[PDB]
Amino acid sequence: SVDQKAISTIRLLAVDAVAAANSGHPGAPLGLAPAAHAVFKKMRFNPKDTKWINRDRFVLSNGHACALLYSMLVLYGYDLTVEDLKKFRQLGSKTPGHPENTDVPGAEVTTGPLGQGICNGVGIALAQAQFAATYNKPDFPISDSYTYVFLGDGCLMEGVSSEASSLAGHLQLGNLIAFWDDNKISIDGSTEVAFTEDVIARYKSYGWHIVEVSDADTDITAIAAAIDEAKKVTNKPTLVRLTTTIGFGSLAQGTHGVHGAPLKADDIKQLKTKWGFNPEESFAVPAEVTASYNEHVAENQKIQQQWNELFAAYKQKYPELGAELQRRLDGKLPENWDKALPVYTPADAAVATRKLSEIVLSKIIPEVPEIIGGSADLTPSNLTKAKGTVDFQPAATGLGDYSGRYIRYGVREHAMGAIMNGIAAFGANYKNYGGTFLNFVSYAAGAVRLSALSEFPITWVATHDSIGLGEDGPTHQPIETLAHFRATPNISVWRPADGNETSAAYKSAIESTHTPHILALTRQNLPQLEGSSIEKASKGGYTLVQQDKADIIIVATGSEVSLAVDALKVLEGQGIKAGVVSLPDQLTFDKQSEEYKLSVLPDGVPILSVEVMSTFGWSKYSHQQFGLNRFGASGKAPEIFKLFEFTPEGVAERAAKTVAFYKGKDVVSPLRSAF
Amino acid sequence: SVDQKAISTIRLLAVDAVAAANSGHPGAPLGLAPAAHAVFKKMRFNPKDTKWINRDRFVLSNGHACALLYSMLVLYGYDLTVEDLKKFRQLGSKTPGHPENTDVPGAEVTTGPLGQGICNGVGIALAQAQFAATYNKPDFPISDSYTYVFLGDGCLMEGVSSEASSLAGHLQLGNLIAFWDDNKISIDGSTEVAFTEDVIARYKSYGWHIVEVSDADTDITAIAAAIDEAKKVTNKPTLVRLTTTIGFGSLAQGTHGVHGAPLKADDIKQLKTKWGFNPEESFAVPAEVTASYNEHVAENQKIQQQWNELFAAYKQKYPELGAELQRRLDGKLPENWDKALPVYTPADAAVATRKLSEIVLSKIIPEVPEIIGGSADLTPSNLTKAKGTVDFQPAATGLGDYSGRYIRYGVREHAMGAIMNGIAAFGANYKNYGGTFLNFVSYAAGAVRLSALSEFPITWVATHDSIGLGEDGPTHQPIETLAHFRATPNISVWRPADGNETSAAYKSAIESTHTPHILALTRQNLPQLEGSSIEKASKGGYTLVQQDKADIIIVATGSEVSLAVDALKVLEGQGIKAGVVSLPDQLTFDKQSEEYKLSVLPDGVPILSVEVMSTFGWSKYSHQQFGLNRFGASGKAPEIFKLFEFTPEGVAERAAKTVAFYKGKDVVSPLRSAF
């Protein structure tokens, strides 16, 4: 049949791509081709409009199997061709060895690191439910799409997928349909060596619905029926168990050797002959397969055309909601939304930056409907919920509604990070955030790095940023954390010193379209600074205290800016004139013009950095660095600062030593370099 | 009864400690005091010998509840007193806000970050099974101890605990007995808001045995009976569900407000009066409670005395095994074990450092019985298994034996990291390792940081360290990873360039007693260097190529050392004389004498660093830095190096620019500083 020919085409495109690269993973593509064929036939999508907001989404969580995804995209006429498949895994190609949403049309997210994609799927489904609850009206199903995820055994072993699956079951996400490639093989061999749990019983314990397809190597009728069954279960996510043979059809089917290495040439020949293809030909695409797939595309395009007319009628019946939805689909925030950001003066009281953040959220959430977010069981500590909003929960629980704006992630930092990526991936201008203690953002490093690589504008509200948290002690006090994330490409790491800087940090985080943000916020109160403003802090680094005859400039962030200002006063009594630079975001600062940056960090003056965590990175901006390169302590925070000499006198002493060290030396800006 | 009085004593010591600090967590201590009393009465331990190798181990995984642990340790006469409890959460005290194994007698591990302790318990139990299988003989139960873990709802939400619980069930670890504080409350309020899964059904799906105690606020008879039942189930770990009231007895019992803040003074008064204590008194320890606990200690000490005689008889009957066991309990490696380390010369072939690592392990595993380790489903890629060893598996599976040496962790990096910490915590000189790709060590950051804080000599075998891995692409290629871990206190991050450096890295990792190691290893082949040796590389940094009239020194690691040597040849043709420094471990180098370090990085010469990942940290050792501060690419590795100009010509160009930039300037060592 044409369906059987399509499945063979998919299988052989994937194998031929791996063969051309002499690199990659043929086994899972061979085993999952029937399911991929069946799922894509049920999906609504437009290869010529990858951003249609009511499309069904597909996520390949087992990203090493991406020759399968690329083959589907090519066959359906996305902006990816057989010529791109021939360049699989080659430098600069549109077919990298794991799918990248920035590079691959039709790749919703970046997968490859195991466990992430299923969590991203949870976030896409969460966003769809929130979006539908916000916009749908009687006779106006603006949003009714599904989220389809393929996953393997490795994904099921990674703890992040357990976190997200527990939460998805709790949230009753009935438009999520996941498919487990139950092939009993991982890299180390049989799953009997390390993975003997009853997966189905575990997923039932989370509140998922189960469908089992015992012959997923051939039974596309049953796979299609499993999708129909899943769609009838509207209050549970569904796991479809696909019992497959890894490498189906290969001489080496059912072995670990087919997981991750190219097939032998004689194996490929026998595959082709037994499926009716020419063993002398590679990258064959039978025209009847193209015709069949084109018919589905044409039907989907008529569905989108009707959706466009539905949207136009929605704008007539619901003018305000329609204009809001249009603005979001255009990627634009509300006009002048930032006028809601709080502004402070030096006459205002000292406030912890965690509380300033709460205040910002309380002002902007009512004005910017595309902001949603949550906490990983630290809501009363991170201060992440705006009073008077409701939680995102299924209404059946009585605890919230899908129109809610605040997500109770539970103690699930890693899944929160990957779910945030999925919410961003949904689109519709979602600007979403997640709160935890800064030190536990590290639990989510796998997902945070993918936020950066995927260019998603997610925001971590990362409170309790330092030894300033006090008594919880060194297991909770960050040292390395900002260095880690600042060293990752494309992460904006804001460490605001006061009210105006905290508003600038949120302006950056909410306006972002391609850069994730981490906001490092304090437990303890900080004064409002003389010289701060949203305008200046928006440059990432700025001159807080200008001193034309400076003997030294102190550059600092966060809680240490006020410390630097106090040190300036001590230094004045020692006959030393200091300037102060505040550097709330190194990435934003780095992106300013060279002339602006040199106006902040000029030649001809020693520069000392002060920040109560690792000194890594700080030599970009300073000649000498005063930081904390050892673990913290359990005690009252002011006593810890005193112990480590982060006091006005301790900073002044090091500033005076810095001035003395450069006496008789020619000093150029840390911004200068040889290349 | 005296048991009821002991439970009240525990509860009130914990509440009084929180009250004195005006900080900390009274709720879980109040709810878990009956269980703590019951479990410690069943445990074998010596407060005067915390390292007895056959003790039962206790882990408080819900580490915020540590006022409970400290109260037990005080009551049993560990080296912790009521005066220490009065200093709970105070700077410098022996009672920090979360338990630290380096600081607290009787704290086996460092907990506080949720999910870790249960995984540590899995590792303690794994080690006990391996140890018993190695040493026990008929009539000689050298090792027969249990591992008792307390955990809460937060621990059960963290994915790392799911990973470790799946693995522990697979491994049939029948001496592990965990207790879930089923109190239905977390920081955000009811568990109904985010945690509605059927925990018991999930644990059954992993192959655990379950015991439920419905009235754990009072029913110590049932808790004791649950322990007896768990001990009869020798082929499954057991989860005991303790249904408790958080804050039991408080006016605010059963609320989130009792989780994490001190009780009100009038609440404490009513607690005391209803339990028969004086409301005007704090830190009361009734002498009858001390007497009862002392009787259990005296019995345990007689058990240890008999164990010592059993051990002496074992040494007579099994002289070689007895001497091996004695050496391990003394913390000593075999005499001259390091003579087994492979040595190379520049005439030997190029080898990837992952393969050199395999070769080292193959030589040292047969000679050092306390080495065990595994991989997170990357055994044929990390090359972590010595041919001819057997896997650690329950014999019932037919796949290994508990005497085995190689652990199949599955795709569970975070739990592998925390299990490694537990294996180290067991003691007996275990030197244990875990393999994965370097980029996915980041999935385990929560546990890695605890290895450093806990001072455990664990080792990550972290292969595929850079863009040198090639086609898998930027989702797999580290950029920030070494900066992250080098910025963490107390992590030795070895990036060996060749065979001799790889042997030095293992010498350091296996000799370690207080510092975790990460070995960053290559996929691709590297040449044996002229000038390398185990002796020189053991200093962490050394002069590979000495040039008395150097115009520049190039400092490099790993794959970039050979690149630097090739660049030296290009520079010679441009009239520029370079030296080369190899810096295989920055931490080890930093610990050398100031004079040694200055002999490697002298004054008076520009120094350029070369390493194909983040430049963070490198200014400690260099004036200019050539690194990679953007994500990688999917292609053949040599093409990626060329794209980013990590070629002999690209390094030479930057070296020449560095020489030019410092013409006419006075240059001092990067090791100099102002303070």
Ligand SMILES: *CCCOP(=O)(O)OP(=O)(O)O
């Ligand atoms: C995301 C899960 C994939 O896990 P594996 O089972 O290792 O993949 P496979 O293609 O079946 O070898």
Ligand SMILES: *CCCOP(=O)(O)OP(=O)(O)O
């Ligand atoms: C390690 C798990 C503890 O989780 P929580 O339920 O948040 O602790 P609690 O003392 O019950 O509030």
Ligand SMILES: Cc1nccc(N)n1
């Ligand atoms: C998290 C992870 N581990 C191992 C392999 C992989 N692709 N991803």
Ligand SMILES: Cc1nccc(N)n1
């Ligand atoms: C990992 C974690 N998350 C939140 C709180 C905590 N103590 N630990």
Ligand SMILES: [Ca+2]
């Ligand atoms: Ca598999």
Ligand SMILES: [Ca+2]
């Ligand atoms: Ca709880």
